[PDB]
């Protein structure tokens, strides 16, 4: 009955919902595994194991479902309305998923696919201090690599490492040169 | 006459040819400028200034044109055939553009536009040790940023820096959170 509900709910969660649910559960169900959670039932299995989900304790599951906007599943399988959840989670200290975690999730949802790619380039730059964007051509990069003294006549290692990962013909261009 | 030739040749070089020509000239006409070379005549102007191009010294111009595969211009304006250039440049120590420079140029030409984007991601990783690719989703990145201790409840600075560069709504999500 509770078991039936968990399966019926699990059946309606797609791979996108699962990813979000796993992320929002990170402060409880640790990133670290080589036993990756591959569907919603496996996620529910671990929540039960951590004693955060059971017949008489649905509060974490309801909060998860609310935060990923599955209001359909909340009312259909848990007889729970939007406003019940709002009132619950507006009471200070009652939310189990931190506003921090929810905030990153909402960012994830707002980001376009081109914006995501910009995020990647912008992020790497913060760490590496090399400016890269979708519009740069390869020659300008070479010129930059040469100012970084990571590219040069006798410094083809990084170049070869990158090119070997990309295309056979490329690394052959390099190797043909080297003698 | 020589002047006329230089203009006629310059007129037939497009912005892609110019980029290549500037790159191949890097060991002579230094990267460093705030006087950027914006067409082929400006490039020829500087070559003349460095005494690497004049009426009686066409050898560097011919080598440039050969290396960017403008065999049409070589024969039409410089009365020079492919095999003259090959014989010239097969003689050891006679090439003025280094095989290293030519090699990078040929890489540039072989790289597809998707391969280029992979080059960018792969390059940044060599420097930053953060693995990024086109297929990663934002949540997995957040999870990685959290292992790097560059993201967290009281560490939103890098996040805000990246997001402010991308979209107003994004930074608003972050700011709305912070109180």
Curated annotation (Swiss-Prot), chains A, B:
**Residues in DED domain copies:** 1-79, 99-176
Q: Where in the cell is it found?
A: Cytoplasm; Nucleus; Cell projection, Lamellipodium
Q: In which tissues is it expressed?
A: Isoform 1, isoform 5 and isoform 7 are expressed in a wide variety of tissues. Highest expression in peripheral blood leukocytes, spleen, thymus and liver. Barely detectable in brain, testis and skeletal muscle.
Instruction: Please report the PTM annotation for this entry.
Output: Generation of the p10 and p18 subunits requires association with the death-inducing signaling complex (DISC), whereas additional processing is likely due to the autocatalytic activity of the activated protease. GZMB and CASP10 can be involved in these processing events. (Microbial infection) ADP-riboxanation by C.violaceum CopC blocks CASP8 processing, preventing CASP8 activation and ability to mediate extrinsic apoptosis.
Implicated in which disease?
Answer: Caspase-8 deficiency: Disorder resembling autoimmune lymphoproliferative syndrome (ALPS). It is characterized by lymphadenopathy, splenomegaly, and defective CD95-induced apoptosis of peripheral blood lymphocytes (PBLs). It leads to defects in activation of T-lymphocytes, B-lymphocytes, and natural killer cells leading to immunodeficiency characterized by recurrent sinopulmonary and herpes simplex virus infections and poor responses to immunization.
Quaternary assembly: Heterotetramer that consists of two anti-parallel arranged heterodimers, each one formed by a 18 kDa (p18) and a 10 kDa (p10) subunit. Component of the death-induced signaling complex (DISC) composed of cell surface receptor FAS/CD95 or TNFRSF1A, adapter protein FADD and the CASP8 protease; recruitment of CASP8 to the complex is required for processing of CASP8 into the p18 and p10 subunits. Component of the AIM2 PANoptosome complex, a multiprotein complex that drives inflammatory cell death (PANoptosis). Interacts with CFLAR and PEA15. Interacts with TNFAIP8L2. Interacts with CASP8AP2.
The record's family statement is:
Belongs to the peptidase C14A family.
**What role does it play?**
Thiol protease that plays a key role in programmed cell death by acting as a molecular switch for apoptosis, necroptosis and pyroptosis, and is required to prevent tissue damage during embryonic development and adulthood. Initiator protease that induces extrinsic apoptosis by mediating cleavage and activation of effector caspases responsible for FAS/CD95-mediated and TNFRSF1A-induced cell death. Cleaves and activates effector caspases CASP3, CASP4, CASP6, CASP7, CASP9 and CASP10. Binding to the adapter molecule FADD recruits it to either receptor FAS/TNFRSF6 or TNFRSF1A.
This one is known as Caspase-8
Lineage runs: Eukaryota, Metazoa, Chordata, Craniata, Vertebrata
Gene for this chain: CASP8
Span covered, complete protein:
2 to 180 of 479
